[PDB]
Structure formats: C-alpha cells, structure tokens
Amino acid sequence: ATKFPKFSQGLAKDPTTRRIWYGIATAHDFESHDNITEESLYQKIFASHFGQLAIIFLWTSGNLFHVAWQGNFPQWVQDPLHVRPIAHAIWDPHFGQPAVEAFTRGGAQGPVNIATSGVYQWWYTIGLRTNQDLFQGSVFLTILSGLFLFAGWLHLQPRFQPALAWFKNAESRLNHHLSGLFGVSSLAWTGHLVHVAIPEARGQHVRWDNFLTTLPHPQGLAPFFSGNWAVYAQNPDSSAHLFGTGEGSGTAILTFLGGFHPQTQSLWLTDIAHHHLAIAVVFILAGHMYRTNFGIGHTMQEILDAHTPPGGGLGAGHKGLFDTVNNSLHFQLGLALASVGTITSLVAQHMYSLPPYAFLAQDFTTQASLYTHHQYIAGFILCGAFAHGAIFFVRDYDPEQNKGNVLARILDHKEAVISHLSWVSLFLGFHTLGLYVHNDVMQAFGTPEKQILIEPVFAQWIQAAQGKTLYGFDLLLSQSNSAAFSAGQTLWLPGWLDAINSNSNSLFLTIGPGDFLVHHAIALGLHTTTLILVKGALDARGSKLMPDKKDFGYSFPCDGPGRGGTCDISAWDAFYLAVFWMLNTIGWVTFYFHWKHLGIWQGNVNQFNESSTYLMGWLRDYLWLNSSQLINGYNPFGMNSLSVWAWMFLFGHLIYATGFMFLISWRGYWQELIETLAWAHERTPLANLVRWRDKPVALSIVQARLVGLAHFSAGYILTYAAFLIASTSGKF
C-alpha cells in the first residue's frame, strides 16, 4: 500500500504502525532487501562505508572547530596543569541567570562545557599550538569528508561500480591494507613526529611555510644513508626538559629511553617516533606476503588447506575455510569486531598506565572518562562480534562445504563447550560471591581479621618479573644479575624501572586481596557473557527444543507456548541477554578502575585496600561517599556547575527505569489497552473527524526487547558518566 519500506514489500503492505518501526529497524540489513544481488549488496556496503568515513571526519572537524572557536586552547597551552579545557560554548535560552554565572566559571567566554575527551592533550602533544592550527585542521577535515562523500557517490556510478571479483580479492586487499593503510600511514606519522611534533616539544616553531628549510636533525639524512643510525639516538631530552620550550631539550629524534617524561608524566616523543618507524617497517614487510599479479607470494587458500595436523586431531583442519570466510560477510564482520573490540580494550588498558599525551596523567577526569568510554565501546563491539558470528551460523554457514573442518568439529562438540563454560561461570560466581559475603559478614560482626583475603601472588610475581621490587620476588627484571636485566640495562630498563618502582604513576599499580576479588569478579563477568554469546551462536541453527531453528532466522520472537514454552529461544535473544551481562561486566571493570584511581589520586591508597574486600565497603565508600557533590549540583539553596551532572544523573536513572517497563510487561496487555484506546477515539465526537493511516498496535515482542534494552543501556551509560565525571571533577 504505502511506499516507505521500498526495500521490503512485506513491510510496505503492513497496515499498522509496525511498518514504520520495522522499516527503520531493517533498513541496513541489505541482504534481506527485496531483489538484492550479491554485487549490488557489496556496492551498497562500499558506498555506506564511504558515508561512515565522511561522518567520522566531519565529527573530528567539528571537535576541532568548536575548540578553536569557543575553547581556551592557547590559555591551556600556557598553563596545562591549572586550566580546565573548554569543549564548546553553551547557548540555552532556558537558562536562568545563576545557571549562566555557574557555567561561566568566572571566565569571559560565557557559559561553557569543560571537555573530558582529552583532545587538548593530544593536540598539544602532536604539535598544535594556536587556534589557527586547529581551524586549518578542521577545514581540511571538512574537505576530506566532502571528498569521501564524492567518492561514495562516484563508485555507485555504473562506470565506476566495482565488480564482485574486485570485492572478493582478499590477497590484494590484505597486501595493500597492511603495507599502505598501516605501514605507510605509520611511516608518515613518524615523519610528522620527527619534522613537527618533536621540534614543537622543544620550543621550535615548524609549520608548512618553513618545514622544507628546517632540519629535523642537525646532521640531516646523511647518518641514515651512511648506515650509521645511532646518531639519531644521541643526545636525547634530559630529565630537566620543559615541554614546549628549549630548556633541557636534546637533538635526538629516535630513542628507546622508556618510562615517562618527568614533567609531562607521559611517554617520550622520540620513543613514539621510533615505535611508529619500526611499526611502519614491520607492516610494510607484512604487506608483501600475499600473491597478487606478480607471481610471488602466498595464496591464503593454500595456507589454510595445508594446515591440517597429520594425526587427525583437527579432522580436515582448515580445509574449505577460505571459501567460508570469503563468501560470508558476517564471518568477516565477526572477526573484525572481535579484533577491534579487543584492540579497544587494549587501548583502554594502555593509555591509563602508559599515558602517551603530555599532561594527561594529571587530568584525572579525562583519564577516567577515556578508560570508561573505550571499555564500554569494547564491550558493545565484542557483543556485536558474537552476534554476527551467530548470524553467520544461521545465514551463511554451509555444512557440506565445511565437512569435517574446525568449524564443523566445534559445532559437533558444542555441548561440551557450553557445559564447560557453564561450569567455570558457576564456580567463579559461587566462590567470588561467597568470599565477598563472608568478608561482609566478618565486617558486620566487628571482626575484620576473620576475612578471607587471598593474596594475588601470581600477578605480583608477574609484576616482580617486570621489575617491581616491592613484593620481594627476585627474578628477571628485579634480579640485578639476571640476563634479562643486563640485556636491557643500557637501552630501556633505567626509565622502565624508574617508572615501575614509582608509586606516583599508574604503571603496574600495587595490588592486594581486593584486586584479587575484583579480578575474579571480572573473570566471572567475561566467562558468563561469553557463555551466553557462545551458546547463542552454537545453538543458532538448532537445539533439542527447536531442531529447525535455522529455518526461522536469526531474530524471531519465540516458537509459541507449546513444548513447554519457547520464550527468548532465538540467537538474537541470546545477544539481548548477553548485553545485560556485558554491561554488568564493564560496570565492574570501570567501578574498579575509578575507585582504585580515586584512592590513588586523593593520596589515600588504604581506602581501597581496606574497603574493597567487602561489598558494603564498595557501596558506602565508593557510591554513597562520592555522590555527595554530584547530587548537590542543585539544591534548595541554589545551584553550581555540577547541576547539569545531577540532572543527567536523575535522567539516566529515569531512562533506566523506563526500560524495565518494556522488559517486564509484555505485549498482550498493551495490545488490549490500545484496542480500548482505538475504540475510544472512534466513539469520541470532534475527534473521530481525524483518523489514523496506520492502525495503532502494540510494539512487537522482539521490538520490545530491543527498546527495553536500549533504554536500559542508555540509562546505565548516562548515569555512570554523570557520576564518574562529577565525582572526579568536584575533587580535582
């Protein structure tokens, strides 16, 4: 009838409001669209990727422009330890005058938002200094976004439409991406660091108008071509160097000092340049591996076919897996999301402990925000990775094409995998909760010496082997006569051992029994989320309750009340269940990060050590104690700058609560209520003159699960972001 879901004739003939919702929700599932071919599917994905790249570049241009126009970047550059960086200006006509003065914060730029993204530290570290530089970067990124939009439009034209074989050329794409997208870009970033960022850190002004006449090193490129490369590591920055000035500055461009700059508490820029140079060489070498059209190189099909153990332990091995991966976009998406989310977690774990930007470790709100942001992003991406693995198993998996290889064999013992995951989750939950409750009862009965406080000796042993001498294990980097000590002693071990034996940074924090208990809680969260996702992926094709589940697709409401009842039996429902557990897991992780770092930043390390061993300590000394300033952002006596975070705190609590309605109450109540409402409209005079085009119906079962999950997740994120930013900002 209607024409909004033009890609789905079944949705377009839906006479209800479900057509609009499902038309929005299935818009980007291009494979299920009407009259879609494989080639047009790949071309649409290509153009959508161009659009996403343009959106990303426009977003970065917007951040740069708003900082350049309404921020205080030069003032922050002058005083990075005592100036709050400004995100953007506030123009709200609903503001009262005390709201105007509170968000001005005694400045002259009017009401502003104090940035927590850490773009100031990054842009200062990479050599930007003025508002003109940020504006030029924003204009350049807007132009780049427009170019990518044009390229997306251009490659949809019939002359420039790539063929299906072009999209399936795995060897050429891998070679080009590894050599140029990783290696050449890393080499160019080394060039930027050597020519611009390192001179700007030493008080030397290098821009486009003078970089052709400015020598990055006094000896030029002659030591590079002569092979005497150790010249570039000579005379590094001294420990008394002041960032952005020439005082204490060396002339080296590629070092391996290790540790941190003493003033900025961040990694040395010459170390970063040498890292990116070695990364560039390694990745350029790795991009010369696969055969394209030159007669040399590996074929990935031959590599996969050769790797089958001759004892038959893996069956057919990896035979036929090239066609499985290459023909399935959901397999590739699952692999990409798994790796990207793991890398996002690595980014979170490495930026707090090895801060790469100048004056980032002293910005506590920024560090907490960046860690929490990237860990929640990583959790969502891991959930998506397993979801698209399940979608691959439903939609793209061919059992006959994968006869006897590792995929079919891991499907053939899925009960063992799921049951062992269930066992490890049950063990971790039982014993972690039991130890926490035992310690809570010990603290309640006034006898904290009866607590079970297991020392994390394995992780302390790892810390000792990496050079932390506090725990008294004498091995490797903490053993002065060891070979590992003597090998790195002239290269990077002085700075590394200075940083790892100092308790004033976040490099390998001292750990105790509270760290043990929360790490086992994290393990329980990871294993349970994995169990839900893995069971959903492996039972996606079928179970004993529903042996023909592949015939019904990835997402469907149920199979009805028969056979005992089949609520939430689809693999989509397993994803939906696992989002709750992922949110709980990242909540535990970020709670741990924030409380341990709050105790470290306040100078009271013993607060975490003496209160994290029992859950009442967590509640009282972390949530209750640190919410006092946040919930006083506005009170009967007035308001302050934290009033926006108090309002968002309550906002997130409300959004979280509204999701419980969609998750607890289910459809048939609401459909009957809407039936009475539709009766009421038709029988009401002066209002039956107007009438609906789409018949009002209640939201579908799957749609309700999605909407409740979205409200739950949004409330979770908004509540914790408001609490984290307010509690870190009000004290620091």
């Binding site: 009838a1 209607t2 024409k3 909004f4 609009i20 038309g23 126009w69 309404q70 200006a89 123009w91 730029q109 009017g110 085009r693 789409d694």
Partner: protein, 33 residues
C-alpha cells in the same frame, strides 16, 4: 568569541526549525501511498 550572534540563530534553527521540517517531510514520506 567571533560572530557571537551565530549561536542565537543556529541553535533555534538546528533545534526547532530543522527538526520541524524534518518530521513534517518524513511524516509526509512515510504516509505516501
């Protein structure tokens, strides 16, 4: 800031004028037969 009159024009435009036109046009689009 330079051109400080711009928020007073663009924030009502992006916040009120653009969403009104957007919802009106999208409502006309999704109800089209």
């Amino acid at each position: 800031m330079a051109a400080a009159y711009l928020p007073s024009v663009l924030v009502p435009l992006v916040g009120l004028v653009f969403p009104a036109i957007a919802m009106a046009s999208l409502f006309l689009y999704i109800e089209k037969e």
